[model samples]
Target: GEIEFIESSKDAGFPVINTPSKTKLEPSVFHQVFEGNKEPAVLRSGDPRLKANFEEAIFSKYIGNVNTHVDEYMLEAVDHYAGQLATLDISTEPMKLEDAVYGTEGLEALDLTTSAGYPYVALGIKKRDILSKKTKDLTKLKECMDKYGLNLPMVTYVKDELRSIEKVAKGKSRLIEASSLNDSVAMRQTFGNLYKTFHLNPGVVTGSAVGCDPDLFWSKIPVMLDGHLIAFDYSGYDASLSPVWFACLKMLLEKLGYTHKETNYIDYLCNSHHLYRDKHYFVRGGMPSGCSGTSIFNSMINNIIIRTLMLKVYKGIDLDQFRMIAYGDDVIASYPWPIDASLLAEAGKGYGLIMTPADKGECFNEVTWTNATFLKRYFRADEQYPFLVHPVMPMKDIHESIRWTKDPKNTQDHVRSLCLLAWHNGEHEYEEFIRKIRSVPVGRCLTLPAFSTLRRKWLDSFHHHHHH
Candidate 1:
């Protein structure tokens, strides 16, 4: 069940989207920019425009590095990973898994057996470790899987394969799907005795998957009504689905003809998704944001591309009447303007079985979460728009940037932020302990708190008065 459901590739990490503008440059150029950029990523010291360029260069760099390592490695093992996702055929989201929300009965909050929910935390963990060579410690791997009741023989076998690779390469394993699905973040985590074995970087392989069934995946969750089904593969805090979908996409592209070589859309479609569109022209949303698994944003871009491609393909199926969820093959439920359901059905028929939802046994898990009062209150962004806009956007520009100097905290509430950065600046100062500013420069921090008050009074007032 695990192997069949996951789209295994040689490695796991971010997917690179090299635009036409980036084609002329060497892959190393992109690599150079990404490696050098540092966080707070914004620089108050250097040229502001350069800072903007540097930030984007960093993003491109990160994506490039991953692509060179993890993604390319996957191409080496495509036959293995691609076979995984296609092997699975299930009906509906796992029922027992759905109701397991809100913490399973008598279990603690973070229990693994309790339906890890959307953005599948489990999927991410399994896919990543299998591909991540450094942390492929089979023994510790089994220990983790035991906790989640994912100790199937198949799972054990997969990890053993990874361990075999390590032994063959002498502590060097490349992508081996494992049994346990825990924190997906661990997928790229180097498995040193500690942080000492951190030589290899986050791998990358450009991958994208469309949903075969949009309605079914969407029905599994409500808030994501506008979300593209591709997001389903990697939505929420548990980014498990991302790897499986990515692997599947990469494999499919490879089969289709993306050689991972430098070439123009005019020259070749190769094994990439670009061929899905005309002249290798990707419609908007045809690509996923690097490191960000599919989301509504990608969907928006996909719809336009599909419509245009359909018009070009013209199978007498009136594809213009249909909607698409990027190239992954999912449809946009809310396809607007002129497209109708009947036309969409015809288009689906024309696309063939793999693109057919009815043929693909789709499943989804539910997610319900609540933020702690203090965490929620302190993290609210003061400005409607916190990000700054550069006067002239450059090819390598970060439209908006945020800087975090120290690990800001909420001393009175005793909660520390675990994210890249929290956006709230509602309060002036939480003693000398926690202070979050809008931007690095003081000029960027929103106005000083109106009527500064002591921490205790502030907490008391928020608790009693703010309660509705």
Candidate 2:
């Protein structure tokens, strides 16, 4: 159920749109800029006007020294720890056995004859030691199942088959790698453990889940829905918050009776991986991009817990001050500061999810969030003058205008489709944008490629609207 949000390769993250000028660039160059790199990326263009306007913003502002040791050592550690743990010979180790006797020097008998929820808790026990206890507990549980006719599912493991991983880094951001198939298996074990625990006790985890809803609620909570736009985007978001992912998960699982059932399995899987960067090798914290279960776990568990903390820290604030949306590690939340920044610092530290001071954004009370660059392209620019023009204008009017001879299939068909759609939907602005291009000869105005592009984009828009 949680994997439903896992986007396929082409559908993952942000969508890349090519303006007429961008499309004019060499095909390979465009591929490198949009396809190969991450968002907040830049490209050097041949046009002087564009080059002059965007040259500075193209490169990232947060530069850092090249040090691969961090990643190199972490990866090695993961391999060492995970290998030893995975190959443990349970049968060779003597099991702690005791006869049932009440009082002091005997085993405490537990009556599992009833159907009431019987929770387990761990108190300051080493991980490997807990594994032994888990084995013993499972044996006992199986006996009870047979005696009581109970049929609980057994916790099991699938093989970790991933053989290779890759890493990429941008300015100031630590190297992020893709996980192997093995990593995904490991991640799943942990996520499944925590998910099942919380799911069984929804009465306790519901508050956190409600606050974690990415939209509709979180956007309006914390602050009132009435003020100027202020958004804070955490830099190096995922890497900075990686430690908290494990810490928070561990904390909850232990408290929720999952420790006795799946601790060893969860720990081994998350503790394996290697990284290479800038001709140097290293490893680090934070879930890697390649792990299939990364998104599922982050969205379902980590973010909810973080929001739960935030709701506690800032119990009262004006939601109208700004609206926030978090996708992956990027926090597009309202910056309703003058409220306590220290509270955030404290909350982050409590869970090992530190927010560096350098990464925080300043407040903006004058502009509405819609007027900001963050999501300006999503809504129509002039609602009053609406015609069937594209909902998102990627560039200025001049750049967005249809090119008569340049790929009629793409440009012309895009225009025609927008015009007809707008006419059907009663949009005047779109009608006007296409009205002039519509006068051009039909043969010169429409092409197969343009039709294809239009069809895909329109369908995507429909799908997006429906889901959101």
Best by TM-score: 2
Alpha-carbon TM-score of each model against the true structure: 0.20, 0.38
> What number of clashing residue pairs does each candidate have, in the order they appear?
26, 27
Off by over 4 Å in 1: 1-111, 114-179, 182-248, 251-336, 354-468
Instruction: List the RMSD of every prediction in angstroms.
Output: 25.0, 19.2
Residue 181, model 1: Cα distance from true site in angstroms: 3.7
Cα lDDT for residue 136, candidate 1: 31
Name model 2 segments beyond 4 Å from true: 1-175, 185-230, 242-245, 252-272, 277-284, 300-325, 332-369, 372-468
Against the true structure, candidate 1 reaches a TM-score of 0.20
lDDT of 2 by residue, 94-154 (tens): 1122221111121122222211211111122222322233234445433433443421111
Clashes of 1: 26
lDDT of 1 by residue, 1-468 (tens): 011122222123312211121111122212222222322212211333232333232212111101112333234334432342133221112123212211222211222332222123324442333222343334544455455542121111001111121122222211111212432222112111111111111000111223212211222122222222211221111111223223334444344333433112211111112111011111111122221122322332233333433453443434223322222233322222333323333432332111322212253212111110110111121133322111111111111112211212321121222111221222332221123322224323323332233323333432342110
Error of 2 at 104 (Å): 53
- Candidate 1: 10-residue stretch with minimal lDDT: 196-205
